[PDB]
Design a protein around this ligand. Sequence first.
Ligand SMILES: CNC(=O)c1ccccc1Sc1ccc2c(/C=C/c3ccccn3)n[nH]c2c1
Length: 276
Amino acid sequence: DKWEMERTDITMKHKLGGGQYGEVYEGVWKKYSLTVAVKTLKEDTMEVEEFLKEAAVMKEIKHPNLVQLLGVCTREPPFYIITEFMTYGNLLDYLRECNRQEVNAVVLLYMATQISSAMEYLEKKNFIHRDLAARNCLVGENHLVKVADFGLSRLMTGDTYTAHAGAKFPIKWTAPESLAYNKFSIKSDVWAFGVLLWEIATYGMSPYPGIDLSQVYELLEKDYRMERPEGCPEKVYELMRACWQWNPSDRPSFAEIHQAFETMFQESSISDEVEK
Ligand SMILES: CNC(=O)c1ccccc1Sc1ccc2c(/C=C/c3ccccn3)n[nH]c2c1
């Protein structure tokens, strides 16, 4: 296997983001002076197969807006999955703490374009994402945004993936058919993407603010949808609302979504330069 490394090339430091990602540590790949992120797994565990599965998935996936695997150490008790280090952390915290004059309207469009690009790639590859949200997107330099591979699952048959029995997902990001039946399709991801667009537009506000979890499904079933946040362009809100169609088949594909954002991003860019 080309991906294998020797664990002593890595200098391990402290847990990233106060443990919000679980067992992921800042590390240094000594012979490149390169900071990295290192997912680790205790040796006393029953999750070895799942963890190797994550690695195998990471081997198959490659895209500029998906967090990149760098190497694994999987022949010795503490298993490692080493990924690139994203210096600005998760996108949700980034949006909340950022200078909004730097991270302005055009940057927001750019971030959405990047994520939609990643999702269109996954769509074509017959993958779905079980955890599409701002908190699971990572930010590097120059407003580079990548979706984390955590939550990625490949469809072996059909267009639906069923989450492990008893699974509990965050209600406010989850498509109603997924809440109801535990089925995730790429259309469920389109729903989640609409919510992510709302997280971006509001600089990291919680969705359905003030609304209690217990009411969300019924409210959605009865056509309740979040309103347009101030500052949000109408075309972006319309796309958001297209993502929140009750029937999965009425939602646009990520190909259509990415193309819409690419077009809007270009027009803003062109209009930006035209102003001198
Ligand atoms: C086991 N958990 C995961 O694999 C996971 C889940 C959600 C999102 C990501 C990951 S893996 C991961 C986590 C953090 C990172 C980072 C940087 C984290 C960070 C966080 C705060 C401040 C600065 N940096 N770079 N690359 C990463 C890869």
